[PDB]
Amino acid sequence: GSSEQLKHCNGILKELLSKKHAAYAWPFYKPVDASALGLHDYHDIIKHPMDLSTVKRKMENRDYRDAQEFAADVRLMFSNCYKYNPPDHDVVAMARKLQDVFEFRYAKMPD
């Protein structure tokens, strides 16, 4: 719950949104627009949508009180992807790559 730990989270979030990772991060930038994409079963399968723009809003609004709450939202975003999409799908390979970025930097959390 320290300021320092939340700044580490904010750094991770900025990195996930940065051009460095855009080739595989872009499916996670905005909420899944199920209607626009023709995914009429998406909200029957995914109970708690999450995406990086929502994480960013919650960070800016000071919604997150500790790093664990932030990590749970980021991991929820990936979990939704793993739930809705077959494991051999391109978007799942992108999720795995971005989650690799997230988990290895999140592990460097200041104590």
Partner: peptide, 6 residues
Amino acid sequence: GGKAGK
């Protein structure tokens, strides 16, 4: 099965 291929 999931989204359209990206």
